[PDB]
Amino acid sequence: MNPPPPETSNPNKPKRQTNQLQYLLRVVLKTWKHQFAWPFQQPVDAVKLNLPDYYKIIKTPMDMGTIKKRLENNYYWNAQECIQDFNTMFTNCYIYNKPGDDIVLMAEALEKLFLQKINELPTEE
Ligand SMILES: CCS(=O)(=O)c1ccc(OC)c(-c2cn(C)c(=O)c3ccc(-c4cnn(C)c4)cc23)c1
């Protein structure tokens, strides 16, 4: 009943490092240590949690484990692809859950930190 996780490696896509991609892995993702990170560190395990509607409602799942692996495997060419995956992750949480739910307050806090760090993205090549 869970879907396979998102793809994290694709040798058919070209690979590069950029200052912004480095910042996304080393500053943004790592800043993973937050109090509230665990529910976002791996795909939502609908089987474990007995949430058979989760993947009926969320058709673009995303999570920080996936993002980290993507950054490590040079999956993204453009930083904005990675930023989009973060934003997807947050939006999923907002769609599935209701305001004032603990998990939503967790996501809001994580997203505020995420946004602060993106406002300090370094210069593009
Ligand atoms: C990601 C590791 S996990 O799948 O075991 C896990 C553990 C705890 C979690 O929240 C406290 C979640 C979780 C993550 N996200 C992103 C959600 O949106 C989410 C929504 C609902 C629930 C949940 C747990 N039990 N129930 C009734 C609902 C649980 C979640 C997921």
Swiss-Prot record:
JQ1, a thieno-triazolo-1,4-diazepine derivative, and I-BET, a benzodiazepine derivative, have been tested on tumors with success. Treatment with GSK1210151A (I-BET151, a I-BET derivative) has strong effets on mixed lineage leukemia and promotes myeloid differentiation and leukemia stem-cell depletion. Chromatin reader protein that recognizes and binds acetylated histones and plays a key role in transmission of epigenetic memory across cell divisions and transcription regulation. Remains associated with acetylated chromatin throughout the entire cell cycle and provides epigenetic memory for postmitotic G1 gene transcription by preserving acetylated chromatin status and maintaining high-order chromatin structure. During interphase, plays a key role in regulating the transcription of signal-inducible genes by associating with the P-TEFb complex and recruiting it to promoters. The chain holds residues 44 to 168 of 1362 of the full protein. The record marks N97 as: Acetylated histone binding. This is Bromodomain-containing protein 4. Ubiquitously expressed. It is found in: Nucleus; Chromosome. It comes from the Eukaryota. Phosphorylation by CK2 disrupt the intramolecular binding between the bromo domain 2 and the NPS region and promotes binding between the NPS and the BID regions, leading to activate the protein and promote binding to acetylated histones. In absence of phosphorylation, BRD4 does not localize to p53/TP53 target gene promoters, phosphorylation promoting recruitment to p53/TP53 target promoters. Belongs to the BET family. The NET domain mediates interaction with a number of chromatin proteins involved in transcription regulation (NSD3, JMJD6, CHD4, GLTSCR1 and ATAD5). The C-terminal (CTD) region mediates interaction and recruitment of CDK9 and CCNT1 subunits of the P-TEFb complex. It is also required for maintenance of higher-order chromatin structure. It is linked to Cornelia de Lange syndrome 6: A form of Cornelia de Lange syndrome, a clinically heterogeneous developmental disorder associated with malformations affecting multiple systems. It is characterized by facial dysmorphisms, abnormal hands and feet, growth delay, cognitive retardation, hirsutism, gastroesophageal dysfunction and cardiac, ophthalmologic and genitourinary anomalies. CDLS6 inheritance is autosomal dominant. A chromosomal aberration involving BRD4 is found in a rare, aggressive, and lethal carcinoma arising in midline organs of young people. Translocation t(15;19)(q14;p13) with NUTM1 which produces a BRD4-NUTM1 fusion protein. There is a cross-link at K56 (Glycyl lysine isopeptide (Lys-Gly) (interchain with G-Cter in SUMO2)). Interacts with p53/TP53; the interaction is direct. Interacts (via CTD region) with CDK9 and CCNT1, acting as an associated component of P-TEFb complex. Interacts with RELA (when acetylated at 'Lys-310'). Interacts (via NET domain) with NSD3, CHD4, BICRA and ATAD5. The interaction with BICRA bridges BRD4 to the GBAF complex. Interacts (via NET domain) with JMJD6 (via JmjC and N-terminal domains); the interaction is stronger in presence of ssRNA and recruits JMJD6 on distal enhancers. Interacts with NSD3. Interacts with NIPBL. (Microbial infection) Interacts with bovine papillomavirus type 1 regulatory protein E2. This interactions may serve for the tethering of viral genomes to host mitotic chromosomes allowing successful partitioning of the viral genome during cell division. Residues 16-121 form the Bromo domain. Changing N97A: Abolishes binding to acetylated histones.
